[PDB]
Structures are given as C-alpha cells and as structure tokens.
Design a protein around this nucleic acid. Structure first.
Ligand SMILES: [Ca+2]
Lengths: 106, 89
DNA sequence: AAACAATAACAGGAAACCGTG
DNA sequence: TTCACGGTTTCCTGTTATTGT
C-alpha cells in the first residue's frame, strides 16, 4: 500500500545525496534528521500532504516507540534509532552499510 | 511598559484569570478565553490556535511555575483544572 | 546574576482522515 | 458495493531545554 514513514526514512538514509539533511550517526542504526524541515517537506510531497512539517512527522515517529520500530535517542536533538531488525531486511550490518555510504562517524 | 499588555508577567495574568473564577480554578481553554475577553492586547487574538506564540507562553508558564498546580477533571473530554498552589511556591 | 519572554523539541491522548483489503 | 482498520495527520495539553532581554 502507501509507503510507511519508517520505510521512507530508510529510503532517504540509503541514498548518499540525501546525507546533507538526514544521515546515520555511525552508531548502529541511530540516525539524525539534521534538517528536519527538508525531511518533512519530502515526506509531505510523497504522501501529498502539502502542510506536512516536523511537528507532525515526529508525532508519527512517536507512535513507533510502542511498536518497537524506532526509538528516540534521549537528549539528542532530532536523533532517533531503528530498533527493529534492519540487518535482515537490508542484508547488511551497520558497519557494512556505513562503509558503503561513506559515513564519517559522530 | 515591559510587555505589550503592560508590566504584568504572564504568570501574573494567569493568576488573575484563576482568581477571577467562582471556584478558583480553570481549564487551559478557559484561561485562553479569559485572556481574549479581559486583556486588551489579546482581544483580537481570539480565533487563533495553540501554536499561537502566546498560548505556548501560557502552557509554558503553567508547567514551569510552582505557583500553578494541575488537578484532574471528572469525566472524559475534558482537560485538567489549573489552580494556584495554596503554598504559592 | 536572576527573572521573564520567546520559541521550539518532545511525550502522548483524542479524533479526523483515507487508502486498501 | 460498503465496511473496518491501520497508519498516519491534525490538533491539543503538558513538560522541558535553550537562548535572548
Ligand atoms: Ca506548575
């Protein structure tokens, strides 16, 4: 059906030109929305919700905490973490994926 | 004239809103309505939403200040009563 | 130096919305 | 077809961090 937010973020996190606004932090499947308005804008375009913003996007991220899909990294602005089994879905370790995308660690 | 409405702080305003009530308690929504009906500056900011920057300042003052305490309200709906702290912290 | 204002990140309830089976 | 559901989207209440006055 319609793509789901978490799949959308993964899509952006696997495309290296998106790195300026959303990137892996280099710790596992922890990532950062370094420019959350640009990420929300794309999410709005993709779902055809022209009024999408980070306030609303983040609320959908917050429903994922109980579904153990994504969790918040407490005290780090705009930092979240996939806590589902990404290794199985992607066929790569964090280390492998980080090399592939030339991830400078945080 | 430190603020647009005068020398009163937000907190002094909320205090006056709550003291004006028959039962010495109001909901956030009622505090909003008081501001709009009672403080000349806010008189034309009535049909605006919680993102209003001054609604944010009210929520922010109600949680930050120990002089305000939140109390649960009976049925479903139907948000907390805000009252002054008998100790006034 | 301490109070207050401004503003935003964040948690999570409620209800509308809408595409799909 | 209509219907019910999940996944938001929208809005809100409440708590907290930060930076400017
Ligand atoms: Ca309080």
């Amino acid at each position: 059906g319609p793509i789901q937010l978490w799949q959308f973020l993964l899509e952006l996190l696997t495309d290296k030109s998106c790195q300026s606004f959303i990137s892996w932090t280099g710790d596992g499947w922890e990532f950062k929305l370094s420019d959350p308005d640009e990420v929300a804008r794309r999410w709005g375009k993709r779902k055809n919700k022209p009024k999408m913003n980070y306030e609303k996007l983040s609320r959908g991220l917050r429903y994922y905490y109980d579904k153990n899909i994504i969790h918040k990294t407490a005290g780090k602005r705009y930092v979240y973490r996939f806590v589902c089994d990404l290794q199985s879905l992607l066929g790569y370790t964090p280390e492998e994926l980080h090399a592939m995308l030339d991830v400078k660690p945080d | 004239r430190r603020n647009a409405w005068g020398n009163l702080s937000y907190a002094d305003l909320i205090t006056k809103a709550i003291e004006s009530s028959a039962e010495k308690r109001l909901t956030l929504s009622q505090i909003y309505e008081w501001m709009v009906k009672s403080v000349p500056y806010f008189k034309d900011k009535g049909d605006s939403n919680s993102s209003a920057g001054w609604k944010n300042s009210i929520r922010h003052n109600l949680s930050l200040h120990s002089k305000f305490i939140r109390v649960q309200n009976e049925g479903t709906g139907k948000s907390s009563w805000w009252m002054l702290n008998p100790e006034g912290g």
